[PDB]
Ligand binder design. Structure first.
Ligand SMILES: C#CCN(Cc1ccc2[nH]c(N)nc(=O)c2c1)c1ccc(C(=O)N[C@@H](CCC(=O)O)C(=O)O)cc1
Ligand SMILES: C#CCN(Cc1ccc2[nH]c(N)nc(=O)c2c1)c1ccc(C(=O)N[C@@H](CCC(=O)O)C(=O)O)cc1
Ligand SMILES: O=C1CCN([C@H]2C[C@H](O)[C@@H](COP(=O)(O)O)O2)C(=O)N1
Ligand SMILES: O=c1ccn([C@H]2C[C@H](O)[C@@H](COP(=O)(O)O)O2)c(=O)[nH]1
Lengths: 263, 263
């Protein structure tokens, strides 16, 4: 899409050389914001064929609160295979903090139910927030939360959401992250009987990897196709009762899928 | 400043009439970003006089891990009076989280020290985060964090920082928040022997209170003056050894102040 391609070109223009946690090399900028009005369509990248398959399972996996990748193995999702121990555990990563943030005094906070209740009872609150950044349990996680903080906002009957992502692999991860949270907004809006508003994406270290130039340029050479439309074919009675087959997409006619060496 | 007046202009031209926790009423937008190059000048509003005094004492009060306003009283700083109890306590707010985030098992985490070592030993790190949003203790705070979590970034020997502000009182709060965090960058950069880069301000619910509109129209009718220069007379032993006598602002010739009620 336009905002995505424009970000890639900005990294090429303003990016600085910055070695990463392994020495692969990136072109990096710090501080970026994008806005996706979900009324115009679902923000699924079209300059390369993407798939919601692993995005849906991981989101549902997040919402269940289980940080064991068992569910992903049963459904043939592999994005977490190289980070888990033998048990298949990742620590108190996203799912755990979303549903059971542990307190000092031995309690647990279900942030998802709090947000949903806030959106229903007090949609004007400026405190409708979910944070995966549990400073006290970062050392127990196989990976520090990347998309670690998002907030909801209601106005004119439209539900908006802003995400803060401390680190962004532009070519590989960003199309995945955008689609993931746009899905969450649609799911949250449906359970709150609201319309969808804007998805705001905010990034910290936003970077292209040195070995993604050929794939970047190939994608830049292509014109964005019309955005597709999300089709929820079934309305669950709970935000935690969604099923993989509930989600379809129409009018998604992308360019040939682009493949790079993964993470 | 240009960026500040532009945002104030943006709220008036696109804000939504929202009611708020205080029953005052606000014009509100959601999702905004600003950048301040700190080598250009210190970002202290000029279209209305702002008193750096209270700002400095507040930041030095944060970096001590203290949440009692007793220190703020010693220097006639009253910005946190309407929210403290008789003993001047606000609860586990910004300071408590910065210096001693309480874990579930019982330990405490010093985020200021943590970041200072990350910046010195691993400046390429993309997870240099301080967070004040402690979901496990929000119910104990007299007011949820507004400047809720920020990220540091190092490139080309320059130190940058991005803040996420879930809620922003554009007229009263934002000028303090900007100056406050820009001051922290100058201090972090000094202790890490780095130059100052950008302060990136990101906002969630960004709004103007209904009883501030007349003051806003007055301020918008003024032109920003050249930014002043911050001077730090000394190099303290650490980030926590700063004194109010170490800072001095040079070239700050603002328009006359504009008084307005606090909500
Ligand atoms: C963001 C995020 C979640 N994540 C997590 C994740 C973890 C570490 C990372 N590390 C790096 N360097 N970049 C990444 O973006 C990255 C992403 C993902 C990781 C891999 C794929 C992936 O397999 N991409 C392939 C798969 C193609 C397909 O079959 O659909 C691709 O070519 O697109 C997707 C998401
Ligand atoms: C952000 C932040 C810190 N804070 C904390 C704080 C707490 C609750 C709030 N509540 C609301 N609705 N708006 C605020 O911005 C706000 C700010 C401040 C609070 C007041 C002033 C203030 O009274 N400013 C006057 C000067 C008064 C004085 O100190 O002499 C001004 O000139 O505008 C400044 C900062
Ligand atoms: O540092 C700060 C402290 C808080 N505020 C203002 C913004 C809000 O208008 C107010 C707190 O309102 P709430 O959203 O919590 O209900 O204080 C601010 O702008 N900066
Ligand atoms: O949701 C995610 C998770 C990870 N990454 C990418 C960004 C980084 O390049 C890499 C993680 O490396 P660190 O930022 O943690 O060092 O994975 C994403 O883009 N999105």
């Amino acid at each position: 899409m336009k905002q995505y391609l424009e970000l890639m070109q900005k990294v090429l223009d303003e990016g600085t050389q910055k070695n990463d946690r392994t020495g692969t090399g990136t072109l990096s900028i710090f501080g970026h914001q994008m806005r996706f009005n979900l009324q115009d369509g679902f923000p699924l990248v079209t300059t390369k064929r993407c798939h919601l398959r692993s995005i849906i399972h991981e989101l549902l996996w997040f919402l269940q609160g289980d940080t064991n990748i068992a569910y992903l193995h049963e459904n043939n999702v592999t994005i977490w295979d190289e980070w888990a121990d033998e048990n298949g555990d990742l620590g108190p990563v996203y799912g755990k903090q979303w549903r059971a943030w542990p307190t000092p005094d031995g309690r647990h906070i279900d942030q998802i139910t709090t947000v949903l209740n806030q959106l229903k009872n007090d949609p004007d609150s400026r405190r409708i927030i979910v944070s995966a950044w549990n400073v006290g349990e970062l050392d127990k996680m196989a990976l520090a939360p990347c998309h670690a903080f998002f907030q909801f906002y209601v106005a004119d009957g439209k539900l908006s959401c802003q995400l803060y992502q401390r680190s962004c692999d532009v070519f590989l991860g960003l199309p995945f992250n955008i689609a993931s949270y746009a899905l969450l907004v649609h799911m949250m809006a449906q359970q709150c009987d609201l319309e969808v508003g804007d998805f705001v994406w905010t990034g910290g270290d936003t970077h292209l990897y040195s070995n993604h130039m050929d794939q970047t340029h190939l994608q830049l050479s292509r014109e964005p196709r019309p955005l597709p439309k999300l089709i929820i074919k079934r309305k669950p009675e709970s935000i935690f009762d969604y099923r993989f087959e509930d989600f379809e997409i129409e009018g998604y006619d992308p360019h040939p899928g682009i493949k790079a060496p993964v993470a």
